[PDB]
Amino acid sequence: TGSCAEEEFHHYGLALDKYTHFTSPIRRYSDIVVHRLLMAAISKDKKMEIKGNLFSNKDLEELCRHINNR
RNA sequence: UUUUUUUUUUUUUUUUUUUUUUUUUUCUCCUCUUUUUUUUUUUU
């Protein structure tokens, strides 16, 4: 995300401007990330706090390079 | 009518000890051919 510029956020091949998967938390790894984050969002938009951190910049970039490799 | 004598199975028992798997060679060695390397996408 905000580790890069807007121009690097698009999904030109499909004419979208943002595209990921969320339909497979089981056979992949970015999807469990997306699960944790979406559920953190539905649980945080109540004005409380989600104890226990989620990620950090370097962690996310090493995970995404690992997933590209795999 | 034929008496008397010529030994036998070596003696001994009431001595201390503080190590340790194995064990000892063999040299340098020409990998052949459409490629940059493909890549989104969706159904597990």
Protein CA at A7 to nucleotide C1' at B20, angstroms = 76
Query: Which residues lie closer than 8 Å to A40 by C-beta, 6 or more apart?
Result: A50, A54
Q: How far apart are CA A52 and CA A33, in angstroms?
A: 14
Residue owning tokens 């409380």:
A48
Query: Which residues lie closer than 8 Å to A55 by C-beta, 6 or more apart?
Result: A33
Q: How was this structure determined?
A: cryo-EM
Nearest DNA or RNA nucleotide to A27 (CA to C1'): B44
Dihedral over alpha carbons A60, A29, A46, A9 (to 10 degrees): 60
Resolution (A): 7.0
Q: How far apart are CA A55 and CA A39, in angstroms?
A: 14
Cβ distance A38 to A54 under 8 Å? no
Cα A18–chain centre separation: 11
Which bases of strand B sit closer than 7 A to a protein CB?
A: 40-44
Residues of A (34-63) placing their beta carbon closer than 7 angstroms to any atom of strand B are: none
